Design a protein around this nucleic acid. Sequence first.
RNA 1: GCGGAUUUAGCUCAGUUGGGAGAGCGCCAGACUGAAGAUCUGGAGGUCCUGUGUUCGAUCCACAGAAUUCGC
Length: 194
Amino acid sequence: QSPEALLKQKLDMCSKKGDVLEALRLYDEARRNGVQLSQYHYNVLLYVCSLASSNPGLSRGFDIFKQMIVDKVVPNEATFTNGARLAVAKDDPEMAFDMVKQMKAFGIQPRLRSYGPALFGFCRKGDADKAYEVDAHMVESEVVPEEPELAALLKVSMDTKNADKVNKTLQRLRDLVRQVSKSTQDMIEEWQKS
RNA sequence: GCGGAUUUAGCUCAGUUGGGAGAGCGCCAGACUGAAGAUCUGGAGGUCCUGUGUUCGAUCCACAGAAUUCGC
């Protein structure tokens, strides 16, 4: 059995269990012995570093990120997605938005889960103008949102007293999801009677 | 036309709360035997039907299509 295969199996259990420390240790042990690190290994690595709840692997996540580009292993879509999760954990939604701008330069098509960290991060910060900048990027990427993303765009426009954006974000909300969750449903009728 | 079931090795089929899937038979070799069956050991053998998705990761989860099949 190859040491590169042995590394993947035990890295798999790290992501299954959440063992950030064993993932970080297995990676340095694999790097000391010159084990070839795959794109699969790096993304499982950046995944456990991006898990949120304080994290030890939060600061290491970018050290590992810088190592794969200098190792010149080709990134995936999950690479910049998990990289964007790292950026928003350090309270930098602009960087998470910069990660989804880089993937398009590599010919990588973003998915809905790629815009999550930047969109939700900009909405928590309150900056609606940057939230719309993310949403505009999605519609140009032909990535259609769903209720968590649309309700986030809904609230931030209500929080900034932006009645026009509330109306046409609600429009798309009415064509995309038919059964709206209770949390978002109450949010809409509170603003409609206000 | 409608609804359900099935799709995994050359054949019959397992396996399931997701992290390189096996069995039985067959095929080839070993072993054994004068020789052969049998018994036993090993090996080769896969687009896990197709597309789109969810996921860090899909044979397994979602949707659609195709084929097979049962009832209307």
